[PDB]
Amino acid sequence: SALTQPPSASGSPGQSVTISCTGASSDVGGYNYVSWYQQHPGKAPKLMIYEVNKRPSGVPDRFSGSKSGNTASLTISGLQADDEADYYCCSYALSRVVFGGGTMLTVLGQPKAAPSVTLFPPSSEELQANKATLVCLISDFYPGAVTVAWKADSSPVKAGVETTTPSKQSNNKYAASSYLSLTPEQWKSHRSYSCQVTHEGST
Amino acid sequence: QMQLVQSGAEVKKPGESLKISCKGSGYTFSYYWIGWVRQMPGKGLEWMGIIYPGDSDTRYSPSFQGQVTISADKSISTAYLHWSSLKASDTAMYYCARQGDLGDWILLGYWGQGTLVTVSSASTKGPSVFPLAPSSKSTSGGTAALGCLVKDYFPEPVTVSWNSGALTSGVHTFPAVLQSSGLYSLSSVVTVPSSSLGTQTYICNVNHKPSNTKVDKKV
Amino acid sequence: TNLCPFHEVFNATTFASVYAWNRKRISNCVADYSVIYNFAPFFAFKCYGVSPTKLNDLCFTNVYADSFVIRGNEVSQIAPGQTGNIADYNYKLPDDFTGCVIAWNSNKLDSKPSGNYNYLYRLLRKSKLKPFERDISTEIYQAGNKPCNGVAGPNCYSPLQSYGFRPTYGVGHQPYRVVVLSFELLHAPATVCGPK
């Protein structure tokens, strides 16, 4: 069968949090064929818990596990900034491992920061060429959620636009970038365009 | 010491064959089950199968029975994953794992560095660099932001430096965006005082190994 | 109608020990025993009351499946009228047994180069075990006269000995997974009749 996990979990530093996993199957040997893996962004997972009443060496005692029926729980006693990772549960009873959708663990305490905006007009060189592109850069915002809206002289425009939402670096804050592609004549047909960020309010 | 090393990143196109590897050392590569795991961008892990290097007994997941084959060369202590007629949906990170001295036989206690496989109909294309000059209308406000625009390059790996690697302060490179055409495009900026326009040269340095294009442009 | 849970015992990751052999109740199912033939060639597929190819044509009243692992050379002890450590102390089959015995090698799953110590076989016991009994007691066996007070000593040791299964061991000490299917043949109200 397929396992289910919460899409995301939240917890402040020092406190504890729990992650549930439903759907664990069983066989004749026993019931607990449950394991938990930790995966940081950009590297392979690591076995945190196996045989939920057990755990490997090199893993702090802060990670604990349990099982009540078809529901398994991963208990983390003390939270830290280095605990943010995707936690998956694995059921390996019927000679078949099934990974859950995973849950994102985000620790609070990070202060909110507004996004910095920098709108570059079409460069002169590309203008001499037959193409033009507006670049709206976003950075310094912690909440990884933002939607960029373009407007042409107060008129909404959504022709040829793309955006992303990555994380900058160990700084623990996010950035983003959006590109508006248009023709050189379509550019000089109106005034300088505007880039709206809408982190929580306009910018 | 025990460690698993996997082949480098592979970029292919649909309808082509691929055979990635994952070499294990520091342990007996005949008594441990070796397998592969799929992780698509932003999605969870998907188990594909395992094998016993001693005698080749392959256990495939029902979702990967004939879509992929797994093999091992016990003589050189290496495991393989072979594809035939790749698809756009196969683009993902592929790991290799093995059972540890503890636990059951499919516990997968040890993992690898991870192999990135990307397949897109787009072909190689060198970038066209354009200078993001600091606003002539307002060179202050958020200071003098000088930057360069990298555009129309399919292979994502691209490194942008300023002044042969100098100016590390104030520099910030933004991850690229995958346009509808399959070609990437990113930007690199550097903030300097409004009165520091053209301090030494404020020149960009762009490198694209898949095309061997060395581009340098000032502003 | 409903199918049988045979996939829970044959396609499982781990089996129980010998002293704690797990019994799986089967009822209200259509048993297609052909699903067992497609597995690895068994070291022993021996039926003592019927032929293995005739099961799909018969009805059974109460069918129970037992699972455990042994060192391989002990498979000769899993049969009616046998004697030995296993037959006498862990799993005893009656002389009137009516069923099938299934055994195959598991040196790949239930063995490690470092040694898997999760399988026990109750080396010693005070009295011989009866058919279809289970002694999961882990108390200290009193071989001497002094009452053993819960601590191993010169005259009382632990009864449970662990298997040291390792791939390097030759045939005879490797782990062999054994599945014993016991069913009543008399024509009582049936619950498993097979694919018609």
mmCIF file with all atom_site columns, all heavy atoms in Angstrom, chain B residues 72-91:
data_model
loop_
_atom_site.group_PDB
_atom_site.id
_atom_site.type_symbol
_atom_site.label_atom_id
_atom_site.label_alt_id
_atom_site.label_comp_id
_atom_site.label_asym_id
_atom_site.label_entity_id
_atom_site.label_seq_id
_atom_site.pdbx_PDB_ins_code
_atom_site.Cartn_x
_atom_site.Cartn_y
_atom_site.Cartn_z
_atom_site.occupancy
_atom_site.B_iso_or_equiv
_atom_site.pdbx_formal_charge
_atom_site.auth_seq_id
_atom_site.auth_comp_id
_atom_site.auth_asym_id
_atom_site.auth_atom_id
_atom_site.pdbx_PDB_model_num
ATOM 1   N N   . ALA B 1 72 ? 25.010 -5.817  -12.300 1.00 0.00 ? 72 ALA B N   1
ATOM 2   C CA  . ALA B 1 72 ? 26.210 -5.598  -11.509 1.00 0.00 ? 72 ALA B CA  1
ATOM 3   C C   . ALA B 1 72 ? 27.360 -6.393  -12.104 1.00 0.00 ? 72 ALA B C   1
ATOM 4   O O   . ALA B 1 72 ? 27.165 -7.483  -12.648 1.00 0.00 ? 72 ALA B O   1
ATOM 5   C CB  . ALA B 1 72 ? 26.001 -5.997  -10.046 1.00 0.00 ? 72 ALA B CB  1
ATOM 6   N N   . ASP B 1 73 ? 28.560 -5.833  -11.995 1.00 0.00 ? 73 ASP B N   1
ATOM 7   C CA  . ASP B 1 73 ? 29.793 -6.489  -12.418 1.00 0.00 ? 73 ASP B CA  1
ATOM 8   C C   . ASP B 1 73 ? 30.578 -6.803  -11.147 1.00 0.00 ? 73 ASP B C   1
ATOM 9   O O   . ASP B 1 73 ? 31.322 -5.967  -10.632 1.00 0.00 ? 73 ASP B O   1
ATOM 10  C CB  . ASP B 1 73 ? 30.588 -5.611  -13.377 1.00 0.00 ? 73 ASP B CB  1
ATOM 11  C CG  . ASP B 1 73 ? 31.680 -6.376  -14.095 1.00 0.00 ? 73 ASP B CG  1
ATOM 12  O OD1 . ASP B 1 73 ? 32.141 -7.404  -13.556 1.00 0.00 ? 73 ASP B OD1 1
ATOM 13  O OD2 . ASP B 1 73 ? 32.078 -5.951  -15.199 1.00 0.00 ? 73 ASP B OD2 1
ATOM 14  N N   . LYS B 1 74 ? 30.399 -8.025  -10.644 1.00 0.00 ? 74 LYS B N   1
ATOM 15  C CA  . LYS B 1 74 ? 31.005 -8.407  -9.374  1.00 0.00 ? 74 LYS B CA  1
ATOM 16  C C   . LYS B 1 74 ? 32.526 -8.331  -9.423  1.00 0.00 ? 74 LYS B C   1
ATOM 17  O O   . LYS B 1 74 ? 33.171 -8.170  -8.381  1.00 0.00 ? 74 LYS B O   1
ATOM 18  C CB  . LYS B 1 74 ? 30.552 -9.817  -8.999  1.00 0.00 ? 74 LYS B CB  1
ATOM 19  C CG  . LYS B 1 74 ? 31.179 -10.369 -7.734  1.00 0.00 ? 74 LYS B CG  1
ATOM 20  C CD  . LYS B 1 74 ? 30.490 -11.651 -7.288  1.00 0.00 ? 74 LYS B CD  1
ATOM 21  C CE  . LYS B 1 74 ? 30.532 -12.723 -8.365  1.00 0.00 ? 74 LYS B CE  1
ATOM 22  N NZ  . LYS B 1 74 ? 29.952 -14.006 -7.897  1.00 0.00 ? 74 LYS B NZ  1
ATOM 23  N N   . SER B 1 75 ? 33.114 -8.440  -10.615 1.00 0.00 ? 75 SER B N   1
ATOM 24  C CA  . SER B 1 75 ? 34.569 -8.446  -10.719 1.00 0.00 ? 75 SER B CA  1
ATOM 25  C C   . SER B 1 75 ? 35.170 -7.086  -10.386 1.00 0.00 ? 75 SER B C   1
ATOM 26  O O   . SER B 1 75 ? 36.251 -7.019  -9.790  1.00 0.00 ? 75 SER B O   1
ATOM 27  C CB  . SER B 1 75 ? 34.989 -8.877  -12.123 1.00 0.00 ? 75 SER B CB  1
ATOM 28  O OG  . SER B 1 75 ? 34.473 -7.995  -13.102 1.00 0.00 ? 75 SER B OG  1
ATOM 29  N N   . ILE B 1 76 ? 34.494 -5.999  -10.754 1.00 0.00 ? 76 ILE B N   1
ATOM 30  C CA  . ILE B 1 76 ? 34.990 -4.648  -10.523 1.00 0.00 ? 76 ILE B CA  1
ATOM 31  C C   . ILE B 1 76 ? 34.203 -3.935  -9.432  1.00 0.00 ? 76 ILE B C   1
ATOM 32  O O   . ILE B 1 76 ? 34.447 -2.753  -9.169  1.00 0.00 ? 76 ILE B O   1
ATOM 33  C CB  . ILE B 1 76 ? 34.984 -3.824  -11.821 1.00 0.00 ? 76 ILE B CB  1
ATOM 34  C CG1 . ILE B 1 76 ? 33.573 -3.758  -12.407 1.00 0.00 ? 76 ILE B CG1 1
ATOM 35  C CG2 . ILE B 1 76 ? 35.945 -4.427  -12.829 1.00 0.00 ? 76 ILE B CG2 1
ATOM 36  C CD1 . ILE B 1 76 ? 33.470 -2.904  -13.644 1.00 0.00 ? 76 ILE B CD1 1
ATOM 37  N N   . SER B 1 77 ? 33.263 -4.623  -8.785  1.00 0.00 ? 77 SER B N   1
ATOM 38  C CA  . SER B 1 77 ? 32.498 -4.065  -7.672  1.00 0.00 ? 77 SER B CA  1
ATOM 39  C C   . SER B 1 77 ? 31.770 -2.788  -8.095  1.00 0.00 ? 77 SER B C   1
ATOM 40  O O   . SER B 1 77 ? 31.963 -1.710  -7.527  1.00 0.00 ? 77 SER B O   1
ATOM 41  C CB  . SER B 1 77 ? 33.409 -3.807  -6.467  1.00 0.00 ? 77 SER B CB  1
ATOM 42  O OG  . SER B 1 77 ? 34.405 -2.849  -6.774  1.00 0.00 ? 77 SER B OG  1
ATOM 43  N N   . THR B 1 78 ? 30.916 -2.930  -9.105  1.00 0.00 ? 78 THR B N   1
ATOM 44  C CA  . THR B 1 78 ? 30.151 -1.810  -9.633  1.00 0.00 ? 78 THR B CA  1
ATOM 45  C C   . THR B 1 78 ? 28.750 -2.275  -10.000 1.00 0.00 ? 78 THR B C   1
ATOM 46  O O   . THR B 1 78 ? 28.567 -3.392  -10.492 1.00 0.00 ? 78 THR B O   1
ATOM 47  C CB  . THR B 1 78 ? 30.835 -1.198  -10.864 1.00 0.00 ? 78 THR B CB  1
ATOM 48  O OG1 . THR B 1 78 ? 32.179 -0.829  -10.535 1.00 0.00 ? 78 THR B OG1 1
ATOM 49  C CG2 . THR B 1 78 ? 30.083 0.031   -11.339 1.00 0.00 ? 78 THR B CG2 1
ATOM 50  N N   . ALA B 1 79 ? 27.768 -1.411  -9.755  1.00 0.00 ? 79 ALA B N   1
ATOM 51  C CA  . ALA B 1 79 ? 26.380 -1.661  -10.111 1.00 0.00 ? 79 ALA B CA  1
ATOM 52  C C   . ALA B 1 79 ? 25.936 -0.651  -11.158 1.00 0.00 ? 79 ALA B C   1
ATOM 53  O O   . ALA B 1 79 ? 26.386 0.499   -11.164 1.00 0.00 ? 79 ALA B O   1
ATOM 54  C CB  . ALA B 1 79 ? 25.466 -1.577  -8.885  1.00 0.00 ? 79 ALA B CB  1
ATOM 55  N N   . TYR B 1 80 ? 25.043 -1.086  -12.045 1.00 0.00 ? 80 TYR B N   1
ATOM 56  C CA  . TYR B 1 80 ? 24.629 -0.286  -13.187 1.00 0.00 ? 80 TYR B CA  1
ATOM 57  C C   . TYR B 1 80 ? 23.115 -0.130  -13.206 1.00 0.00 ? 80 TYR B C   1
ATOM 58  O O   . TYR B 1 80 ? 22.379 -0.862  -12.541 1.00 0.00 ? 80 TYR B O   1
ATOM 59  C CB  . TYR B 1 80 ? 25.091 -0.912  -14.510 1.00 0.00 ? 80 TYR B CB  1
ATOM 60  C CG  . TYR B 1 80 ? 26.584 -1.107  -14.616 1.00 0.00 ? 80 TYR B CG  1
ATOM 61  C CD1 . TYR B 1 80 ? 27.149 -2.367  -14.495 1.00 0.00 ? 80 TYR B CD1 1
ATOM 62  C CD2 . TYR B 1 80 ? 27.427 -0.032  -14.850 1.00 0.00 ? 80 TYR B CD2 1
ATOM 63  C CE1 . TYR B 1 80 ? 28.511 -2.550  -14.595 1.00 0.00 ? 80 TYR B CE1 1
ATOM 64  C CE2 . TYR B 1 80 ? 28.791 -0.205  -14.952 1.00 0.00 ? 80 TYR B CE2 1
ATOM 65  C CZ  . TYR B 1 80 ? 29.328 -1.466  -14.825 1.00 0.00 ? 80 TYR B CZ  1
ATOM 66  O OH  . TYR B 1 80 ? 30.687 -1.641  -14.926 1.00 0.00 ? 80 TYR B OH  1
ATOM 67  N N   . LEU B 1 81 ? 22.664 0.849   -13.989 1.00 0.00 ? 81 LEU B N   1
ATOM 68  C CA  . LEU B 1 81 ? 21.243 1.089   -14.229 1.00 0.00 ? 81 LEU B CA  1
ATOM 69  C C   . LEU B 1 81 ? 21.097 1.486   -15.691 1.00 0.00 ? 81 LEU B C   1
ATOM 70  O O   . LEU B 1 81 ? 21.555 2.561   -16.091 1.00 0.00 ? 81 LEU B O   1
ATOM 71  C CB  . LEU B 1 81 ? 20.700 2.179   -13.306 1.00 0.00 ? 81 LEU B CB  1
ATOM 72  C CG  . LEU B 1 81 ? 19.189 2.399   -13.344 1.00 0.00 ? 81 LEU B CG  1
ATOM 73  C CD1 . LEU B 1 81 ? 18.460 1.188   -12.799 1.00 0.00 ? 81 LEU B CD1 1
ATOM 74  C CD2 . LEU B 1 81 ? 18.811 3.641   -12.563 1.00 0.00 ? 81 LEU B CD2 1
ATOM 75  N N   . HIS B 1 82 ? 20.460 0.629   -16.483 1.00 0.00 ? 82 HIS B N   1
ATOM 76  C CA  . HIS B 1 82 ? 20.409 0.780   -17.931 1.00 0.00 ? 82 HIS B CA  1
ATOM 77  C C   . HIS B 1 82 ? 19.024 1.235   -18.364 1.00 0.00 ? 82 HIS B C   1
ATOM 78  O O   . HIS B 1 82 ? 18.013 0.689   -17.907 1.00 0.00 ? 82 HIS B O   1
ATOM 79  C CB  . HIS B 1 82 ? 20.770 -0.535  -18.625 1.00 0.00 ? 82 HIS B CB  1
ATOM 80  C CG  . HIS B 1 82 ? 20.777 -0.449  -20.119 1.00 0.00 ? 82 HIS B CG  1
ATOM 81  N ND1 . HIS B 1 82 ? 19.679 -0.767  -20.887 1.00 0.00 ? 82 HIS B ND1 1
ATOM 82  C CD2 . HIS B 1 82 ? 21.750 -0.082  -20.985 1.00 0.00 ? 82 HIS B CD2 1
ATOM 83  C CE1 . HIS B 1 82 ? 19.976 -0.598  -22.164 1.00 0.00 ? 82 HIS B CE1 1
ATOM 84  N NE2 . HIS B 1 82 ? 21.226 -0.183  -22.251 1.00 0.00 ? 82 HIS B NE2 1
ATOM 85  N N   . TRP B 1 83 ? 18.984 2.229   -19.247 1.00 0.00 ? 83 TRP B N   1
ATOM 86  C CA  . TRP B 1 83 ? 17.749 2.730   -19.828 1.00 0.00 ? 83 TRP B CA  1
ATOM 87  C C   . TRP B 1 83 ? 17.748 2.485   -21.330 1.00 0.00 ? 83 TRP B C   1
ATOM 88  O O   . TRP B 1 83 ? 18.803 2.396   -21.964 1.00 0.00 ? 83 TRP B O   1
ATOM 89  C CB  . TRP B 1 83 ? 17.568 4.227   -19.564 1.00 0.00 ? 83 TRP B CB  1
ATOM 90  C CG  . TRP B 1 83 ? 16.831 4.545   -18.306 1.00 0.00 ? 83 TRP B CG  1
ATOM 91  C CD1 . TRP B 1 83 ? 15.496 4.396   -18.080 1.00 0.00 ? 83 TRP B CD1 1
ATOM 92  C CD2 . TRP B 1 83 ? 17.384 5.083   -17.100 1.00 0.00 ? 83 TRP B CD2 1
ATOM 93  N NE1 . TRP B 1 83 ? 15.181 4.802   -16.807 1.00 0.00 ? 83 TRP B NE1 1
ATOM 94  C CE2 . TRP B 1 83 ? 16.325 5.228   -16.184 1.00 0.00 ? 83 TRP B CE2 1
ATOM 95  C CE3 . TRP B 1 83 ? 18.672 5.452   -16.706 1.00 0.00 ? 83 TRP B CE3 1
ATOM 96  C CZ2 . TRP B 1 83 ? 16.514 5.725   -14.900 1.00 0.00 ? 83 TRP B CZ2 1
ATOM 97  C CZ3 . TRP B 1 83 ? 18.858 5.946   -15.430 1.00 0.00 ? 83 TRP B CZ3 1
ATOM 98  C CH2 . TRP B 1 83 ? 17.785 6.078   -14.542 1.00 0.00 ? 83 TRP B CH2 1
ATOM 99  N N   . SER B 1 84 ? 16.547 2.376   -21.892 1.00 0.00 ? 84 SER B N   1
ATOM 100 C CA  . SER B 1 84 ? 16.357 2.246   -23.329 1.00 0.00 ? 84 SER B CA  1
ATOM 101 C C   . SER B 1 84 ? 15.164 3.094   -23.738 1.00 0.00 ? 84 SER B C   1
ATOM 102 O O   . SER B 1 84 ? 14.075 2.950   -23.173 1.00 0.00 ? 84 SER B O   1
ATOM 103 C CB  . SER B 1 84 ? 16.138 0.785   -23.729 1.00 0.00 ? 84 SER B CB  1
ATOM 104 O OG  . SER B 1 84 ? 15.981 0.660   -25.131 1.00 0.00 ? 84 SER B OG  1
ATOM 105 N N   . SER B 1 85 ? 15.371 3.973   -24.717 1.00 0.00 ? 85 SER B N   1
ATOM 106 C CA  . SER B 1 85 ? 14.331 4.886   -25.185 1.00 0.00 ? 85 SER B CA  1
ATOM 107 C C   . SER B 1 85 ? 13.838 5.775   -24.041 1.00 0.00 ? 85 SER B C   1
ATOM 108 O O   . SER B 1 85 ? 12.682 5.718   -23.619 1.00 0.00 ? 85 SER B O   1
ATOM 109 C CB  . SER B 1 85 ? 13.174 4.112   -25.823 1.00 0.00 ? 85 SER B CB  1
ATOM 110 O OG  . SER B 1 85 ? 12.192 4.994   -26.336 1.00 0.00 ? 85 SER B OG  1
ATOM 111 N N   . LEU B 1 86 ? 14.754 6.602   -23.538 1.00 0.00 ? 86 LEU B N   1
ATOM 112 C CA  . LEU B 1 86 ? 14.456 7.518   -22.444 1.00 0.00 ? 86 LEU B CA  1
ATOM 113 C C   . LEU B 1 86 ? 13.248 8.391   -22.760 1.00 0.00 ? 86 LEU B C   1
ATOM 114 O O   . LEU B 1 86 ? 12.896 8.581   -23.929 1.00 0.00 ? 86 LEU B O   1
ATOM 115 C CB  . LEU B 1 86 ? 15.666 8.402   -22.144 1.00 0.00 ? 86 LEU B CB  1
ATOM 116 C CG  . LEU B 1 86 ? 16.859 7.732   -21.466 1.00 0.00 ? 86 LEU B CG  1
ATOM 117 C CD1 . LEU B 1 86 ? 18.050 8.667   -21.459 1.00 0.00 ? 86 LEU B CD1 1
ATOM 118 C CD2 . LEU B 1 86 ? 16.503 7.318   -20.052 1.00 0.00 ? 86 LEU B CD2 1
ATOM 119 N N   . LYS B 1 87 ? 12.615 8.927   -21.722 1.00 0.00 ? 87 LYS B N   1
ATOM 120 C CA  . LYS B 1 87 ? 11.467 9.808   -21.855 1.00 0.00 ? 87 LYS B CA  1
ATOM 121 C C   . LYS B 1 87 ? 11.707 11.092  -21.072 1.00 0.00 ? 87 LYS B C   1
ATOM 122 O O   . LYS B 1 87 ? 12.552 11.151  -20.175 1.00 0.00 ? 87 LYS B O   1
ATOM 123 C CB  . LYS B 1 87 ? 10.185 9.131   -21.359 1.00 0.00 ? 87 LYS B CB  1
ATOM 124 C CG  . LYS B 1 87 ? 9.783  7.905   -22.153 1.00 0.00 ? 87 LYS B CG  1
ATOM 125 C CD  . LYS B 1 87 ? 8.539  7.257   -21.576 1.00 0.00 ? 87 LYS B CD  1
ATOM 126 C CE  . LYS B 1 87 ? 8.075  6.095   -22.430 1.00 0.00 ? 87 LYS B CE  1
ATOM 127 N NZ  . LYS B 1 87 ? 9.128  5.057   -22.575 1.00 0.00 ? 87 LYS B NZ  1
ATOM 128 N N   . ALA B 1 88 ? 10.944 12.127  -21.427 1.00 0.00 ? 88 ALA B N   1
ATOM 129 C CA  . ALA B 1 88 ? 11.042 13.400  -20.723 1.00 0.00 ? 88 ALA B CA  1
ATOM 130 C C   . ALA B 1 88 ? 10.736 13.262  -19.239 1.00 0.00 ? 88 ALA B C   1
ATOM 131 O O   . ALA B 1 88 ? 11.201 14.085  -18.443 1.00 0.00 ? 88 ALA B O   1
ATOM 132 C CB  . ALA B 1 88 ? 10.095 14.420  -21.354 1.00 0.00 ? 88 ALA B CB  1
ATOM 133 N N   . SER B 1 89 ? 9.967  12.246  -18.850 1.00 0.00 ? 89 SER B N   1
ATOM 134 C CA  . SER B 1 89 ? 9.595  12.054  -17.456 1.00 0.00 ? 89 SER B CA  1
ATOM 135 C C   . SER B 1 89 ? 10.693 11.400  -16.628 1.00 0.00 ? 89 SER B C   1
ATOM 136 O O   . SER B 1 89 ? 10.586 11.378  -15.398 1.00 0.00 ? 89 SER B O   1
ATOM 137 C CB  . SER B 1 89 ? 8.324  11.206  -17.370 1.00 0.00 ? 89 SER B CB  1
ATOM 138 O OG  . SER B 1 89 ? 8.522  9.937   -17.965 1.00 0.00 ? 89 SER B OG  1
ATOM 139 N N   . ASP B 1 90 ? 11.738 10.871  -17.264 1.00 0.00 ? 90 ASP B N   1
ATOM 140 C CA  . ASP B 1 90 ? 12.810 10.201  -16.540 1.00 0.00 ? 90 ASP B CA  1
ATOM 141 C C   . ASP B 1 90 ? 13.802 11.171  -15.910 1.00 0.00 ? 90 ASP B C   1
ATOM 142 O O   . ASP B 1 90 ? 14.676 10.729  -15.158 1.00 0.00 ? 90 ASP B O   1
ATOM 143 C CB  . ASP B 1 90 ? 13.557 9.250   -17.475 1.00 0.00 ? 90 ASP B CB  1
ATOM 144 C CG  . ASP B 1 90 ? 12.664 8.159   -18.030 1.00 0.00 ? 90 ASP B CG  1
ATOM 145 O OD1 . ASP B 1 90 ? 11.709 7.758   -17.332 1.00 0.00 ? 90 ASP B OD1 1
ATOM 146 O OD2 . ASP B 1 90 ? 12.918 7.700   -19.163 1.00 0.00 ? 90 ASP B OD2 1
ATOM 147 N N   . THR B 1 91 ? 13.694 12.467  -16.193 1.00 0.00 ? 91 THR B N   1
ATOM 148 C CA  . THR B 1 91 ? 14.607 13.439  -15.605 1.00 0.00 ? 91 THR B CA  1
ATOM 149 C C   . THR B 1 91 ? 14.406 13.500  -14.097 1.00 0.00 ? 91 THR B C   1
ATOM 150 O O   . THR B 1 91 ? 13.321 13.843  -13.617 1.00 0.00 ? 91 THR B O   1
ATOM 151 C CB  . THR B 1 91 ? 14.393 14.818  -16.233 1.00 0.00 ? 91 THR B CB  1
ATOM 152 O OG1 . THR B 1 91 ? 15.296 15.760  -15.642 1.00 0.00 ? 91 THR B OG1 1
ATOM 153 C CG2 . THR B 1 91 ? 12.964 15.306  -16.028 1.00 0.00 ? 91 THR B CG2 1
#
